[PDB]
Design a protein around this ligand. Structure first.
Ligand SMILES: N[C@@H](CCC(=O)N[C@@H](CS)C(=O)NCC(=O)O)C(=O)O
Ligand SMILES: N[C@@H](CCC(=O)N[C@@H](CS)C(=O)NCC(=O)O)C(=O)O
Lengths: 208, 208
């Protein structure tokens, strides 16, 4: 630290890393980039891959949402207890990223027309996470091992996103359901999720 | 170890991890899955996310190509010299994954019709890697730091893939060009890239 999140005024790909920082009692600065400023071009041209989020940690500048998640996970001890758990954490996060990309494809390229088929296929896309939970201490703890990881925050975000898209989609998955309620009940995270900082921010850039 | 790669008979998403194993002097078993066997359904149903590659390391079973790359990188010391370099390695790999997904979208959903526009936009997609190279010891070493990382193998694979799609696409990028020649010249990797094991395997599953 200090930590600075440079992003558009939406939850989007920064929701999970923000949940992580809040739940971990970290402090950080939000540098909001308006659509107007982005269209100006200078900031975009200076971004490694021409996109946001951009993350500043002291003198270190990073790009890529999952890189930020892994960085915070690595430096704050949220990346498994050993190398085997670390691999499992990656396996979960890669799965979360895959579904997030499918979600992104839906809302940005075929929402109204593809929404129905997507929701029908959703159960099959959520089952893997329910299965992982069932194979780890009966799913009473975290997605991997007995300690929270950056993948828990990313998965939580994706699940919350889908509950909005398809209310009750987690009713068919007892472990995921309890898991979401459990993580959402963690004091610092609960406070964050209920604050205007989170609540009054639109879900996706599509809303911009 | 022992290591086992379970995949279709193509380079696809296993090319980079294979280059890594070969260049690192590792031994591994290839369990080829034919389209027929896949259509049978049993293997697919047993895969965490219903897809390949599946990777076995001793008693550990992993899925997700980037998870395999990170696992080998972590266990073989190809993940940066410190936490800062580790983050940079992730930043590069996430960028490689992003472009690979764009490439995948092209060949599978709009090849013939989108090929021209994709190639025109390619320079802008490759510039970030040229820039990273220019900011690290003049690009005379690796993509991050002075030691090879799993991201080098993944980037190398993506660059080779694009040279086939658009011959000479690296001519406008001196650092990337030299970088590819340099990595491709590493003894063990050079031997692997020239072997039937690599050469006679189709590039993508699309060829199946
Ligand atoms: N793989 C990147 C994706 C970044 C991305 O898609 N950024 C979008 C917002 S969610 C953006 O900056 N769009 C504006 C543009 O492309 O110029 C990550 O995970 O951070
Ligand atoms: N995110 C996964 C993607 C895996 C993937 O796309 N697998 C394809 C081949 S490259 C597959 O198994 N297709 C067969 C199927 O889905 O039934 C990874 O990086 O490993």
């Amino acid at each position: 630290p200090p930590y600075t999140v440079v992003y558009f005024p939406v939850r989007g790909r920064c929701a999970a890393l923000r949940m992580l920082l809040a739940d971990q009692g970290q402090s950080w600065k939000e540098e909001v980039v308006t659509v107007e400023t982005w269209q100006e071009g200078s900031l975009k041209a200076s971004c490694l891959y021409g996109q946001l989020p951009k993350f500043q940690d002291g003198d270190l500048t990073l790009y890529q949402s999952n890189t930020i998640l892994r960085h915070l996970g690595r430096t704050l001890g949220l990346y498994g207890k050993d190398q085997q758990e670390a691999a499992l954490v990656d396996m979960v996060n890669d799965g979360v990223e895959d579904l997030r990309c499918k979600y992104i494809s839906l809302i940005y390229t075929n929402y109204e027309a593809g929404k129905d088929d997507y929701v029908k296929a959703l159960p099959g896309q959520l089952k893997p996470f329910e299965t992982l939970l069932s194979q780890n201490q009966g799913g009473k703890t975290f997605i991997v091992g007995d300690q929270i990881s950056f993948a828990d925050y990313n998965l939580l975000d994706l699940l919350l996103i889908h509950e909005v898209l398809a209310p009750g989609c987690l009713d068919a998955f007892p472990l995921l359901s309890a898991y979401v309620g459990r993580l959402s009940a963690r004091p610092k995270l609960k406070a964050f999720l209920a604050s205007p900082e989170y609540v009054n921010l639109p879900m996706d850039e599509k809303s911009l």
